[PDB]
Amino acid sequence: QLKPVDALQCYDCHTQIEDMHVVGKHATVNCVHCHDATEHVETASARRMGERPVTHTSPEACASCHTAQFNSFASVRHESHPREEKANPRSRSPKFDTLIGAHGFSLEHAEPRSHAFMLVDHFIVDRAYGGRFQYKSWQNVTDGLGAVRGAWTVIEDMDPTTSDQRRFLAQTATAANPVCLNCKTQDHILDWAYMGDEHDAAKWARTSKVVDFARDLHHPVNCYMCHDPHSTEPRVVRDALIHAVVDQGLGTYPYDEAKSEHVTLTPVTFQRGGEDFRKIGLLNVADSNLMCGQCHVEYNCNPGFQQSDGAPVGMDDRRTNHFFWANVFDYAEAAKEIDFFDFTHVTTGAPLPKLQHPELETFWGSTHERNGVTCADCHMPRVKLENGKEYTMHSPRTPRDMMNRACLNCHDGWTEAEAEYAIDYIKNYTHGKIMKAEFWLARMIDLFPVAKRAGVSEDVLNEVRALHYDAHLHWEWWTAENSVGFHNPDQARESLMKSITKSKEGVGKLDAAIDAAVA
Amino acid sequence: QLKPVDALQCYDCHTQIEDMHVVGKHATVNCVHCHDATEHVETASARRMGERPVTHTSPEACASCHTAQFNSFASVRHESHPREEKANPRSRSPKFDTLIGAHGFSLEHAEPRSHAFMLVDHFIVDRAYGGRFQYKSWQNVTDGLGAVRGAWTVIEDMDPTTSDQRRFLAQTATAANPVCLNCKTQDHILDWAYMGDEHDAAKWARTSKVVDFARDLHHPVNCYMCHDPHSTEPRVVRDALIHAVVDQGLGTYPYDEAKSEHVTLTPVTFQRGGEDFRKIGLLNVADSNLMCGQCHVEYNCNPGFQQSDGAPVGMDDRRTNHFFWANVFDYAEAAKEIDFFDFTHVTTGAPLPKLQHPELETFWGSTHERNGVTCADCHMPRVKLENGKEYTMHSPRTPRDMMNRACLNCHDGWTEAEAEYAIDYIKNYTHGKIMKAEFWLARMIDLFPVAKRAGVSEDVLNEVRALHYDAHLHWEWWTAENSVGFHNPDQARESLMKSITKSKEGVGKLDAAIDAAVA
Amino acid sequence: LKPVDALQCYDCHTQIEDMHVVGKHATVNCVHCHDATEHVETASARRMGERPVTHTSPEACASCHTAQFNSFASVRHESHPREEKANPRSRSPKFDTLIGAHGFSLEHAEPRSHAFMLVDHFIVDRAYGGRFQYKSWQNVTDGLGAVRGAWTVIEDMDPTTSDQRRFLAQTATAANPVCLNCKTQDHILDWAYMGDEHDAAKWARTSKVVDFARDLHHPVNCYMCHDPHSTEPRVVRDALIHAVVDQGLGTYPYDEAK
């Protein structure tokens, strides 16, 4: 049973926390709810931490006073198909194995499921840790509350005696590295320097042994990722987001200068031994586009290569923790700005980008974004109660489960069936274009070995490799992006038609050169 | 508010209309409901039209007295998947892009949806007008009543200043021509000479600028397509149907001479300046096989080529507005009769037919057709009311939505689940054969470049091109036809097995010749 | 139907012309609701000649207004039918004490759907001594049949007499001609304002109700709320016009402005 501490004693040293805490809606909430600092208080100085206090990072620490939000946060949507592979005629990318080749995603790329599972799913997917981590039982796949309480309560390490990345099962990969975890958990928020730079005060960095880092982490999407625990104010904590918006001055809405003045991030920096260590970004308004955009964006969180000379770019380089902060039509220029590509296609030899869930950068410029709508309006609205305080739901999911709040409050002349039909019209149209982009891209790729074997020149092959970069970018954006065009149907349509145009041009060039060489 | 005209004054000149109007169930319905003829009456002579009277062609003109039928006609089935591409593992023809090659259908071929949308969908599909016409908002896709009231209330032209067919978006085609519109609308019924021949009195013809024609049209599947507006009697208006049944003497049921004597079309011809101009075909009984067969048939409505010498066949030629009026086993002979094929396959170089929704010609000879069943019995029955006049529904759709009326009234020993299971048994079986026909046809097609590049002789390639014609015909009939075999399961089975047999023969010949040439 | 020359009709019917030519029925020919061939052959402006027929079935309107007609004939099965109110399950459990020997004590059921109103008036135990009865207890569901005509679904137990009397032991003969004005207006051209005796009226307040009943067929005729000539909204019920106009009370007697 908790005993409150003398907050004034803490404030004597912790003046920034004092300024945040005394002024906001947690002014009456005592430190003991989230910190055990008895030995710390006995041993600290103005400058030395002394004994490190415990910080309780479980979402359950908030549940004593916010049970409603915590229960919603831990909830599971069983209708979100679990562990469903995308390289599959029943899913998003039937030809993915041809198109992605030997990239790590070829070992497994499933569709997303409920937020409660995010850290568990990161740990156990076949592409991440060589199959090292596994659910303790296949019964455990249902346990959202268990996952929230801690990954290691439901999964286990197949070899606690070693820390190396290796394969435990034949068809797995070891693609995980420490940067990944920033979009799964912030349990390490006090143990990771801004951007993951090596730092005297950081136990973990981009260059850490990822198996050891994994074992130190527990909880998914911590509540304090979107709310400052001291002031309650809305914020973001994700380093690479703050870097793009603030350090690089690109703004919260990089395509809209006025909106970027209306929605702002105010950086706060915390130090260790008088040296800058970590940052947060305080929001002036609770804009969920920025909160959700901590994770639902295209990023680098992985080694790659330089476009200029092909040299490896490893985890020591800041480019391996980067938000591109660009729409699909600006992405190629943004990747050139950092002189970077992800992988060389195993079949075609083309340098290629690897794209991931660019929801926010797709949403920019869309009709709903232009009308001031945000992610949470459609995916995470308030509950509706005849006789209750209407809190915000806290496990985002498709608007199909909540159409009256998500759509019909604005679109008041539609029935639920009509609004869903409008969704399906866009998704069906967009999916059809994705299928055709895959047909043409796979056709181009399958012709590369024919061309090489027929003696087609390097000049022709290099021309088509350059087309492959763009054919790939303007296809993969849309298999990566989870709305199947709904977030921006006109952009999806223009981009996918560009992918097809490029692949058709590449097929034509290869067929002509093969026929000439023959022969 | 309408004021009635003196009909006797009209009849003085319009003696055929008098004979039709005074005798039928519209004898009390005044001309002013459907015509504004004040200046016409002031200026006409026995032979000159003078000022052209207005003819109201909106289905809503009928709604003053037939609201029930009009409301049903405008209704939308949201469960009919909209804008769903067929070249897709989730739809009818997963390998369509290989099989159809560079044909215009490769730019987009969606599944059908509710009748209300037919003219809109024609205008906006990616293969038709280069993307020139577009819904004004993606919200508008739900608006069936809006579409019925006029296409241009819900879609717009991206460049009203020009009339040429061109691409506005990269992956579109300009396959539309004026003949298409005859199966979408009959707003042009007084502006189009029989067969679309150029004619002094016709504003529009097969050779018209299709973008200009499009702008003059508004409403889908006009009510008077199946009902004479003057007499109320059942009729057809589609020129190419009347041409096959009457002018060419093939009969309403070309495979059944006795049934063709029982169900008849009586032509009525109307003149302009003493010259034959347009025709309708009066039905002796309200046989919906003929009414629905105005559109749900295999046709030419497009340029093509001569089988004999390969010469282009353009819109000036009557062959571009033609009903083949033949079952799948007679089709090759029927296309030879007019010396015609649609396209040369881009990969194989084979002349090929292009098939479209041959529902009526598939239905002929089937068990239900032989038992006197018609399309409307399963797709457009009467409403069921405990205490009301039971009118006919007017938006045809799957019998799954109305199983008691569509099936179980006859099949009185089945439950709804049993009747649906019998449908699914046939569709599953037929779909499996379509998949195998695609596998074998795609396999044959993919071997053509290997054979050409290995130096296989033109004699062998020409043998396999002739097999390709039949392999294609006996596959595509079944992806074109929308019942997935239900309308004629034994015919679907024989035809698809023939497609497979032909493709297997072609693969064998190509493999043997490649091996010999090599090794 | 073959249309008549309405201009000819207008030569002797200016009051109807003025209503017909200006409204939304201007194009609707007289033949939909009147058979007047012998009338035209024999009339002068000062002599009716043969009385023309006027069709009063709601089904006369269904040729052009099927949607409204179908809804008009519909039956709400959830409205409990033939449920007596003097009953612990209904509105007035002590009704038999309170009303005593009044005719309503023989039977007073809750209302049900409009389609049945004339039928129900004819067959209730308090109205005609049980003289009129459904032809079968199956017929109670038939809303459309009732709309098409009461006598298609009910029958008279003694067509040979016209007196009000009891046919069943616990019935009453409370009906009189005034009742029918709230059940039907098939009699609209045969009933003078207020039901006064009148040379031109075959029926009146003082008529033999059994004979009057046999001349009536359809419930709540469509033209009770809509003028058939102009389409404009109207009332036809004499007592309501008498309250608003003759008694000088106005349409809303508690609100002068309204």
Ligand code: HEC
């Ligand atoms: C009880 C001892 C609490 C603990 C533990 C947590 N919170 Fe809290 N919170 C508490 C109170 C009394 C209030 C003010 C309520 C009021 O309006 O009177 C709050 C408020 C918040 C808010 C603010 C919402 C708003 O109105 O602006 C947020 C976002 C919030 N609390 C978040 C939060 C988090 C994430 C917690 C775990 C780290 C947490 N709270 C714990 C009381 C208590």
Ligand code: HEC
């Ligand atoms: C990083 C910590 C994240 C934040 C912040 C947000 N999301 Fe998220 N989301 C994230 C992951 C890693 C996943 C997949 C989890 C798994 O185990 O597979 C998701 C998933 C979703 C989904 C799909 C849910 C489903 O039913 O399938 C949605 C609809 C979604 N996310 C939306 C969303 C919103 C609206 C956010 C801001 C309120 C948000 N997410 C933040 C990672 C992270």
Ligand code: HEC
């Ligand atoms: C009693 C006769 C059982 C029946 C019927 C079903 N299950 Fe079962 N299951 C049972 C036991 C005792 C266990 C082991 C539990 C443990 O101590 O670990 C299980 C296990 C499972 C699992 C996990 C399997 C694994 O990890 O190897 C799953 C996914 C599971 N059970 C599901 C399941 C389903 C869906 C059932 C209905 C078809 C079912 N079980 C029946 C006992 C019994």
Ligand code: HEC
């Ligand atoms: C924020 C910019 C992220 C980074 C860094 C990583 N992931 Fe991620 N992940 C993110 C989101 C928003 C989602 C849900 C949306 C989606 O398209 O899946 C996910 C999902 C996953 C999943 C579940 C789905 C799957 O691919 O199987 C896994 C297993 C996963 N993420 C693993 C993973 C790895 C190994 C990472 C570093 C290489 C990584 N994630 C980083 C957001 C972000």
Ligand code: HEC
């Ligand atoms: C970003 C992806 C979030 C995470 C992680 C958590 N919350 Fe949240 N919270 C979020 C939004 C977009 C909102 C609505 C803000 C608005 O003004 O519209 C909220 C709101 C709250 C509140 C306020 C009361 C309410 O509206 O429900 C509280 C007390 C709160 N959130 C608590 C909370 C808890 C306990 C969390 C971990 C279980 C948590 N939030 C995570 C966004 C996000």
Ligand code: HEC
């Ligand atoms: C208010 C905050 C809204 C929410 C919630 C939803 N929609 Fe919306 N939508 C809104 C506006 C103001 C508009 C523009 C209307 C106009 O004047 O043109 C739209 C537009 C759409 C569209 C058309 C998009 C386009 O053509 O670019 C669609 C298909 C649409 N809306 C659907 C839709 C759905 C299904 C929603 C629930 C997920 C939804 N909207 C929510 C306002 C708001």
Ligand code: HEC
């Ligand atoms: C009222 C002024 C009408 C207009 C406008 C339209 N129709 Fe009509 N129709 C009308 C009547 C009074 C009747 C006779 C009804 C009866 O049986 O007494 C009809 C009949 C038809 C039918 C006949 C069905 C049959 O019983 O054989 C058809 C097929 C029909 N009407 C079609 C139709 C069309 C297509 C209209 C718009 C062009 C149209 N009608 C207008 C009255 C009126």
Ligand code: HEC
């Ligand atoms: C030409 C004017 C047509 C006539 C006459 C008939 N049909 Fe039709 N039908 C036509 C088109 C162009 C379409 C596709 C419309 C679109 O926008 O996609 C259709 C569609 C159908 C369907 C599918 C409806 C659905 O829910 O998906 C059916 C079941 C159908 N058509 C049947 C049918 C019947 C039975 C007809 C005679 C009563 C009939 N159609 C006539 C074109 C035309």
Ligand code: HEC
């Ligand atoms: C009558 C013989 C037709 C001719 C001439 C044209 N179409 Fe058609 N169309 C017809 C039917 C019966 C249907 C529904 C059945 C089906 O298989 O689709 C259609 C459907 C369409 C559609 C919607 C479905 C799709 O293919 O995307 C479109 C866009 C369409 N039709 C366009 C179109 C064009 C461009 C035509 C001239 C080249 C044309 N149609 C002619 C019947 C008939």
Ligand code: HEC
């Ligand atoms: C052919 C594809 C049709 C179109 C276009 C329209 N109607 Fe129709 N109608 C059609 C059939 C097959 C039938 C049933 C005929 C039979 O005897 O079984 C009908 C019937 C009517 C009627 C008669 C009353 C009824 O059965 O509902 C009317 C008044 C009628 N149709 C009107 C009408 C209207 C107003 C239309 C445009 C909105 C319309 N029809 C188009 C076939 C077809």
Ligand code: HEC
């Ligand atoms: C066809 C020959 C009709 C007959 C028989 C009846 N009505 Fe009618 N009505 C008819 C038309 C063409 C119209 C105009 C429709 C329009 O869209 O404007 C009407 C209109 C009415 C109205 C509405 C007037 C308004 O203010 O909107 C009413 C109330 C009406 N009709 C009533 C009615 C009655 C009660 C009938 C039987 C006595 C009747 N109509 C017959 C066509 C025809």
Ligand code: HEC
């Ligand atoms: C006299 C011609 C009437 C007119 C005008 C209206 N109503 Fe009526 N109503 C009337 C009777 C005689 C009955 C009982 C019929 C029977 O057979 O029992 C009714 C009944 C109703 C009801 C109850 C319906 C049910 O489901 O039980 C309602 C709700 C009702 N009436 C309402 C109503 C309205 C709103 C009217 C103007 C539009 C109206 N009535 C006119 C007699 C007459």
Ligand code: HEC
């Ligand atoms: C066949 C074996 C029957 C069974 C089972 C049920 N009914 Fe019947 N019923 C049947 C006949 C041949 C008749 C007489 C029809 C005639 O020619 O008049 C009836 C009559 C009724 C009646 C009217 C009774 C009367 O007026 O005396 C009613 C109300 C009725 N039936 C209802 C009914 C119910 C509700 C049934 C299931 C409990 C039922 N019947 C079964 C034939 C048969």
Ligand code: HEC
């Ligand atoms: C209009 C002022 C009416 C007069 C005159 C008569 N009735 Fe009536 N009746 C009227 C209404 C609005 C209703 C429904 C509302 C209700 O409270 O019932 C009725 C209902 C009936 C019924 C069915 C219910 C019942 O009492 O059993 C019957 C059998 C009936 N009315 C008979 C009846 C008789 C015999 C009348 C003259 C003595 C009479 N009604 C006049 C409206 C009016």
Ligand SMILES: [Ca+2]
């Ligand atoms: Ca990336």
Ligand SMILES: [Ca+2]
């Ligand atoms: Ca064809």
